[PDB]
Design a protein around this ligand. Structure first.
Ligand SMILES: *[C@@H](C)C1=C(C)C(=O)N[C@H]1Cc1[nH]c(/C=C2\N=C(C[C@H]3NC(=O)C(CC)=C3C)C(C)=C2CCC(=O)O)c(CCC(=O)O)c1C
Ligand SMILES: *[C@@H](C)[C@H]1/C(=C/C2=NC(=C\c3[nH]c(C[C@H]4NC(=O)C(C=C)=C4C)c(C)c3CCC(=O)O)/C(CCC(=O)O)=C2C)NC(=O)[C@@H]1C
Ligand SMILES: *[C@H](C)[C@H]1/C(=C/C2=NC(=C\c3[nH]c(C[C@H]4NC(=O)C(C=C)=C4C)c(C)c3CCC(=O)O)/C(CCC(=O)O)=C2C)NC(=O)[C@@H]1C
Ligand SMILES: *[C@H](C)[C@H]1/C(=C/C2=NC(=C\c3[nH]c(C[C@H]4NC(=O)C(C=C)=C4C)c(C)c3CCC(=O)O)/C(CCC(=O)O)=C2C)NC(=O)[C@@H]1C
Ligand SMILES: *[C@H](C)[C@H]1/C(=C/C2=NC(=C\c3[nH]c(C[C@H]4NC(=O)C(C=C)=C4C)c(C)c3CCC(=O)O)/C(CCC(=O)O)=C2C)NC(=O)[C@@H]1C
Ligand SMILES: C=CC1=C(C)[C@@H](Cc2[nH]c(/C=C3N=C(/C=C4\NC(=O)[C@H](C)[C@H]4CC)C(C)=C\3CCC(=O)O)c(CCC(=O)O)c2C)NC1=O
Ligand SMILES: C=CC1=C(C)[C@@H](Cc2[nH]c(/C=C3N=C(/C=C4\NC(=O)[C@H](C)[C@H]4CC)C(C)=C\3CCC(=O)O)c(CCC(=O)O)c2C)NC1=O
Ligand SMILES: C=CC1=C(C)[C@@H](Cc2[nH]c(/C=C3N=C(/C=C4\NC(=O)[C@H](C)[C@H]4CC)C(C)=C\3CCC(=O)O)c(CCC(=O)O)c2C)NC1=O
Ligand SMILES: C=CC1=C(C)[C@@H](Cc2[nH]c(/C=C3N=C(/C=C4\NC(=O)[C@H](C)[C@H]4CC)C(C)=C\3CCC(=O)O)c(CCC(=O)O)c2C)NC1=O
Ligand SMILES: C=CC1=C(C)[C@@H](Cc2[nH]c(/C=C3N=C(/C=C4\NC(=O)[C@H](C)[C@H]4CC)C(C)=C\3CCC(=O)O)c(CCC(=O)O)c2C)NC1=O
Ligand SMILES: C=CC1=C(C)[C@@H](Cc2[nH]c(/C=C3N=C(/C=C4\NC(=O)[C@H](C)[C@H]4CC)C(C)=C\3CCC(=O)O)c(CCC(=O)O)c2C)NC1=O
Ligand SMILES: C=CC1=C(C)[C@@H](Cc2[nH]c(/C=C3N=C(/C=C4\NC(=O)[C@H](C)[C@H]4CC)C(C)=C\3CCC(=O)O)c(CCC(=O)O)c2C)NC1=O
Ligand SMILES: C=CC1=C(C)[C@@H](Cc2[nH]c(/C=C3N=C(/C=C4\NC(=O)[C@H](C)[C@H]4CC)C(C)=C\3CCC(=O)O)c(CCC(=O)O)c2C)NC1=O
Ligand SMILES: C=CC1=C(C)[C@@H](Cc2[nH]c(/C=C3N=C(/C=C4\NC(=O)[C@H](C)[C@H]4CC)C(C)=C\3CCC(=O)O)c(CCC(=O)O)c2C)NC1=O
Lengths: 177, 238, 164, 177, 164, 177, 164
């Protein structure tokens, strides 16, 4: 299981190279923005529990086909299991923000998750609409652009880490498709 | 029409192939062996003391949803860890199905049959690590020493695997406490005829599965069968 | 891949929790101490060819019996494969300086090493000779900084704790 | 397990006491002297493979009855098993001085450690002579008075951290007696 | 111990069966082969002080580097401890000729040997030269009988294959 | 475990001597009576089904108190276990005759059994009368003096093999009573 | 044939004396330094084609004037006699490492060589440049042992000195 530090190790392992000066300049940028990285994800871990019910029940009022009887959100057992993996997928992109790389994702979350939604009968067209609402939330919380939650922070730039988490959600959105 | 890699619009070859039918026969022997290994537990008409789910009304349904997420993590294994799970369960079932060549023949074909037998044969003669309560701290510290070495592949290089993990959701792991705390008491408050059937079968389990003609490992197993029942396969990372 | 980030998120994934304030604080340790181990990283990378010749011949300086016929240094290409392995160990200690931990040693240099050197009849006491010659060859304000020599050499004697 | 940080929790939880201003100076002393504590255990784990050979071979010149027929170090399994728990008790006391408290010995090593040895036939005084040699290596490396290996260090005093690791081996030494 | 007798009782205990004629015929192998494996029993036991002396220095003849300080052959009582170990091994080879199997070598000499010799800085390649010198100095009709020389050497290179 | 060939090893390893001409007279004789020994086990594997029924019904004809309600032969479940463990100790002594030593009895039969039989409500007086009656059934098969079934064999004295199994049955009949 | 044995008894015969207790110490030096000069000799025997192929064209890469009309290597018979005369010289270097002294060099290769090579116009500086090429081609842990390179590069610059 790898991270942003070990990604440049295995990139330098295959060419048998020591990590020279041209490879540390991304890593010296990675430790210079490490205070912004912990300040980014501490708005994600802050109110993730309301963020899931914002997302999956936001998908229900967007698409009411799943709460039809016989559907994938009809049973009290079945809706609790959608809230079970609705916060797992928010948990595994929070691991992708601490690691600085999505190498933690597709071996522990997306490995075989694509076919087990097809074989169980989960409609994959609404699942991409499920993960996009938390994608719209996570670009708001680390840019401090929510409606009803502004948190105490230090100003500056977070457009680079906005696109990093936004590249993680459609990594889910293309693998489970 | 041509293949789906160029200029098509829907996924094809939705047909029951050879590998799907090979998975389909192997799932059905898994529902036969786990049927037959539950026959020793429920042998009369009543359910036994150890075929229980939980105590709290929300905890009995949490046993399934943990175990439904436990069987996904065996599916979520890597290609090296699947292949080491493949042949080690082949080896531990020939030791299980000992004296028969026909019972040895069936497990070499069917791969989920191998996981089904050696999990159930551990729970038929109750050589599990949950069902044994050691009588004293002499036997307990022998039992607490061996399973920490069995927990030493939960972290192979000091970083944790997924197979040792028990928390899958928010507030999940606290039910995993009290399900095993009640399982520790029910093993302690089991019948007196069953618990001395446990120690003799577990000391017969460890002498054939892990000792292999060693005089020292058989001597500690005959002194401490609680440490013998904590010995498991190394395909289980926990 | 034992690292700072990897062992703190696998413990959270073991219990199924989010990364809490105990877990963000370990990455805060990877700013202050990460200045020192990364400063020793290009010191080893920029001068690696002068290490493995001048600290690689200390294997056959002390253990001179390996050149003799029969043992593991009996010809040129087994001598040449010996300098390649200390260069392999010099990469994996340079790779451990940038992961913040003991990652690339524990998977690619330590695990299974004690069965390869047995069946290939390679003496591991000769392996720790050429590593401990690099362990004491440290003028502390001249190779690197004062604290960079601590974290660089901490992986060296960990390897002697592993090979012996 | 416990440490020195959360020891003041459980001592103040039983009296329902806040950890207020009267109890801050015992923990801020653990912070300013904490950078020595990372410099403390670095001298232990650097030489932990050679302390265990320093101890067990130190027991044979002091007591050559272990290699005798009927001795407890006679079989080559038993020498390796005596070598196995040489560093196991050394790995655990390295956890304690990082913790600042010997609680991790008292539930993962010492709970039932005494009576399991005498039922197996392990002599007590040789294991007492195991840890008293390893107490002497522990105080020698921690002040860098070891007479053949000197490591680079920052100057000052570690007599309090010498006494802290010396307050752990007699806890091993009194419980197995 | 793993012998001919100890295997078939554990095989019948694994099956939960009485000793049948498959297990009964294994001890028939201890009737014709025990006349030759016990022919080389007392030849080692009656001459155990001769084989230890002029093969224990053949360890030191191939590896004369141990007499330098820091190594294992640096003082006389270490060499007096060194001749005891190959006297331990040839006692165990005599113990496995009289038992039929390879039990006393496995239970007492090989199990745990790979953990002690790495931490105590003892070269197992220096062990194996003293073992293998007794194999090829062994004359077939002079030292023992013809079939006993095949039998005694077969337990000898098991230990060479155990250490390497 | 041990056996007969391994007993002279651990008798010689008890002083770390060798195995020479002193201890080999018991072992060079052992191959000579090996064809007596292999014919003794062949006699006892032939007839194990009735000689447990000779024993567990001879226990009935002297003690009918277990078919009395509240005994240990009142249940058909319990009468199988008296027949199942009547032959396991017969299987273990036939292991001991093939091994030449009773080493498999004090770990797989004897140890734990007295602590077993108190926790079952086992009558201890039934233990001694079961083994001693089938002791005379065992040596009747070995010395070919079974008065309702004969067997073809090779001629010679065999009371040394009859006394060796007579030294095994009084071991297991002693501690559990 | 100057060696260690054929000088201590060519002095014991020049005074009419027995083998002295002086001269039994000089053969104890033949026991010690044999294993560096035998292992340098056996390395030369399995590598001879390779080392005289490289030594011979070091003459002709340096000295291109030798193919001129009237010079030393002016036709293919003379090129074949050049590579023969450096195959002979390192065979004598292999011989001196067995005898242990400089005996086989100066009575089969060096005595006469001032007078032979002057009359046939064979240059001494081209003979030196082939032998001095392989003196610093020797790599100290890679080719042979540490002290085995001392013995092999003692007879080489003996021959560079005696020719020049
Ligand atoms: C993998 C097999 C493990 C090793 C090795 C280990 O020491 N623990 C296993 C994984 C693990 N779990 C936690 C955190 C918790 N573990 C819990 C389970 C316990 N509760 C039980 O009922 C039983 C059965 C006897 C056990 C073991 C619980 C509860 C937690 C806390 C979860 C919570 O409160 O949210 C850890 C430590 C990591 C951490 O963050 O605490 C590990 C390694
Ligand atoms: C007594 C046990 C020792 C000794 C200890 C001292 N260490 C001192 C300072 C110090 N050590 C380190 C490295 C340490 N911190 C880390 O974060 C890590 C690993 C990740 C390690 C190994 C640091 C960074 C410092 C601070 C000063 C510096 O930058 O070097 C020290 C000075 C007082 C103090 O700073 O606490 C002492 C006395 N020194 C000795 O002489 C004995 C042997
Ligand atoms: C020289 C100082 C050594 C020594 C080295 C030899 N190693 C030989 C084979 C070998 N070594 C390794 C381990 C090494 N190679 C790696 O790729 C990595 C990790 C990146 C490590 C640690 C391997 C895997 C192998 C086998 C394949 C290979 O040749 O690379 C070897 C040849 C033995 C043989 O071929 O039988 C030698 C001579 N030997 C010495 O005497 C000192 C200790
Ligand atoms: C006393 C307990 C018995 C009795 C024993 C004797 N058996 C004798 C000889 C014998 N038995 C066998 C067969 C046996 N050996 C094997 O290797 C196998 C299976 C693989 C078996 C079943 C053999 C081969 C022999 C040797 C003679 C022959 O070839 O038949 C025997 C003679 C003394 C001796 O041979 O040492 C005795 C006394 N005989 C009895 O009358 C009682 C009932
Ligand atoms: C190559 C490096 C030279 C070169 C050499 C030529 N040498 C010629 C003849 C030659 N070489 C030797 C010495 C050799 N003969 C031995 O028996 C031994 C020791 C056992 C040694 C070292 C001798 C005595 C001779 C002359 C007799 C003969 O033909 O064999 C030679 C031919 C001489 C001629 O041209 O008439 C050549 C050309 N040539 C070169 O260019 C470089 C200098
Ligand atoms: C049918 C009902 C229905 C809804 C509830 C919303 C659900 C919803 N909210 C957002 C958009 C958002 N949703 C949240 C989520 C939350 N705000 C918080 O402060 C809490 C943490 C959490 C509710 C508990 C946030 C923070 C945004 C970004 C904008 C903002 O609210 O400031 C989006 C994506 C962009 C958008 O469409 O606006 C959706 C689909 N939409 C619907 O159609
Ligand atoms: C899906 C594939 C599949 C198999 C391979 C078998 C394997 C198998 N057999 C038995 C159960 C059994 N198996 C046997 C068979 C044998 N016992 C012996 O002593 C002989 C050596 C051997 C014949 C070759 C017998 C006799 C039983 C019943 C009693 C017992 O368990 O020993 C059980 C436990 C169920 C029970 O208790 O009855 C299982 C899982 N059954 C299956 O469903
Ligand atoms: C043959 C009859 C048969 C049964 C009666 C049931 C036995 C059984 N297994 C589990 C449930 C489980 N059983 C195991 C199995 C094991 N755990 C270990 O530590 C060992 C390695 C291994 C054999 C003891 C595991 C890993 C779980 C899930 C986690 C757990 O609750 O322990 C539960 C739920 C209750 C609980 O344990 O919390 C039950 C009733 N399964 C069967 O197959
Ligand atoms: C263990 C807990 C832990 C944390 C919570 C963070 C806490 C933290 N954040 C920042 C500091 C900062 N954090 C941000 C990031 C942001 N600011 C915003 O308004 C956005 C919400 C977000 C954009 C992604 C910026 C822009 C700075 C200042 C610039 C910088 O320090 O690089 C700093 C450095 C300045 C200071 O010391 O105060 C620290 C320590 N670090 C930690 O170790
Ligand atoms: C990048 C890793 C790196 C290091 C760890 C150092 C270590 C080091 N020093 C020397 C080489 C040397 N090192 C020293 C230094 C010292 N001698 C002493 O006695 C003092 C303790 C100490 C002063 C600080 C001296 C004086 C030489 C030259 C002598 C020699 O040839 O070894 C060499 C041989 C090749 C070279 O000169 O670089 C190496 C690897 N240099 C490096 O490039
Ligand atoms: C019978 C044989 C025999 C021995 C082998 C030694 C073993 C030994 N060494 C020390 C004493 C010590 N032992 C060590 C341990 C080591 N030193 C190092 O530098 C290495 C890292 C490690 C060996 C590999 C250290 C560091 C000291 C403190 C003194 C010093 O070496 O500077 C002590 C305690 C002091 C005492 O009671 O005398 C003993 C018993 N003594 C013996 O009587
Ligand atoms: C609490 C009680 C207790 C035991 C009974 C043993 C049992 C045991 N042995 C091994 C581990 C081992 N066990 C052996 C077996 C043997 N080694 C030999 O020298 C003999 C030939 C043979 C004993 C008959 C070997 C060779 C290994 C190492 C390889 C392996 O992991 O199997 C392991 C795995 C972890 C470890 O290495 O310790 C365990 C639990 N260990 C214990 O802690
Ligand atoms: C248990 C095993 C066993 C033995 C090894 C011998 C015992 C034995 N004989 C010799 C001694 C000898 N062994 C031989 C035999 C031979 N020498 C050769 O060169 C030939 C290859 C080979 C003949 C086939 C000779 C000629 C001697 C006397 C010379 C010598 O080795 O000292 C030696 C070594 C020198 C000594 O101490 O005397 C030993 C241990 N008897 C036994 O019972
Ligand atoms: C109370 C009810 C009752 C019985 C059921 C029988 C059972 C019985 N049989 C024997 C005694 C014996 N029992 C057997 C067993 C057998 N004999 C054979 O010939 C067959 C091979 C095998 C039956 C399958 C043998 C071999 C003897 C020894 C005497 C002999 O039969 O030659 C004895 C011991 C007699 C004594 O020493 O006092 C008893 C109690 N007798 C009883 O009093």
């Amino acid at each position: 299981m790898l991270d942003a530090f070990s990604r440049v190790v295995v990139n330098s392992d295959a060419k048998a190279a020591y990590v020279g000066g041209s490879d540390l300049q991304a890593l010296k940028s990675f430790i210079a923005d490490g205070n912004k990285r912990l300040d980014a994800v501490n708005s994600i871990v802050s109110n993730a529990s309301c963020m899931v019910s914002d997302a999956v029940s936001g998908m229900i009022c967007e698409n009411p086909g799943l709460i039809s009887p016989g559907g994938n959100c009809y049973t009290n057992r079945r809706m609790a299991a959608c809230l079970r993996d609705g916060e797992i997928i928010l948990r595994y992109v929070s691991y992708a923000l601490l690691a600085g790389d999505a190498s933690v994702l597709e071996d522990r979350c997306l490995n075989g998750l694509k076919e087990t939604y097809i074989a169980l009968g989960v409609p994959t067209n609404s699942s991409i609409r499920a993960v996009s609402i938390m994608k719209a939330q996570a670009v708001a919380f680390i840019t401090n652009t929510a409606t009803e939650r502004k948190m105490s922070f230090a100003a500056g730039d977070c457009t680079s880490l906005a696109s990093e988490v936004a590249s993680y959600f459609d990594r889910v959105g293309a693998a489970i498709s | 029409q041509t293949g789906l890699v160029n200029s098509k619009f829907s996924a094809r070859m939705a047909k029951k192939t050879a590998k799907q039918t090979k998975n389909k026969v192997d799932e059905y022997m898994a529902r036969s062996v786990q049927r037959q290994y539950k026959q020793a537990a429920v042998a009369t008409g009543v359910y036994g003391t150890q075929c229980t789910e939980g105590t709290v009304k929300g905890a009995a349904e949490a046993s399934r949803s943990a175990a439904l997420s436990r069987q996904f993590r065996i599916k979520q294994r890597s290609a090296f860890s699947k292949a080491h799970d493949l042949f080690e369960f082949r080896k531990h079932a020939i030791i299980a199905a000992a004296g028969c060549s026909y019972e040895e023949k069936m497990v070499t074909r069917f791969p989920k049959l191998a996981a089904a037998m050696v999990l159930g044969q551990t729970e038929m003669m109750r050589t599990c690590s949950r069902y044994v309560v050691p009588e004293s701290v002499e036997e307990e510290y022998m039992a607490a020493s061996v399973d920490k070495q069995m927990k030493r592949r939960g972290a192979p290089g000091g970083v944790y695997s997924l197979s040792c993990a028990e928390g899958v959701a928010k507030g999940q792991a606290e039910i995993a406490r009290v399900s095993a705390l009640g399982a520790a008491y029910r093993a302690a408050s089991k019948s007196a005829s069953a618990v001395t059937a446990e120690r003799y079968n577990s000391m017969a389990y460890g002498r054939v599965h892990f000792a292999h003609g060693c005089s020292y490992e058989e001597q500690q197993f005959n002194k401490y069968p609680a440490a013998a029942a904590a010995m498991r396969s190394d395909s289980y990372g926990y | 891949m034992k690292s700072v980030i990897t062992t703190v998120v696998s413990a959270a994934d073991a219990a199924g929790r989010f990364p809490s304030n105990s877990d963000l604080e370990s990455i805060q340790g990877n700013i202050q101490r990460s200045a020192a181990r990364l400063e020793a990283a290009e010191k080893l990378a920029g001068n690696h060819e002068a290490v493995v010749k001048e600290a690689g011949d200390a294997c056959f300086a002390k253990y001179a019996y390996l050149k003799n016929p029969g043992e593991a240094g009996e010809n040129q290409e087994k001598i040449n494969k010996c300098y390649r392995d200390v260069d392999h160990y010099m990469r994996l200690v340079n790779y451990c300086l940038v992961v913040g931990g003991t990652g690339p040693l524990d998977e690619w240099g330590i695990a299974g090493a004690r069965e390869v050197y047995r069946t290939l009849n390679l003496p591991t006491s000769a392996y720790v000779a050429s590593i401990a010659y690099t362990r004491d060859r440290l003028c502390v304000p001249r190779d690197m900084s004062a604290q960079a020599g601590v974290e660089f050499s901490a992986y060296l004697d960990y390897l002697i704790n592993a090979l012996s």
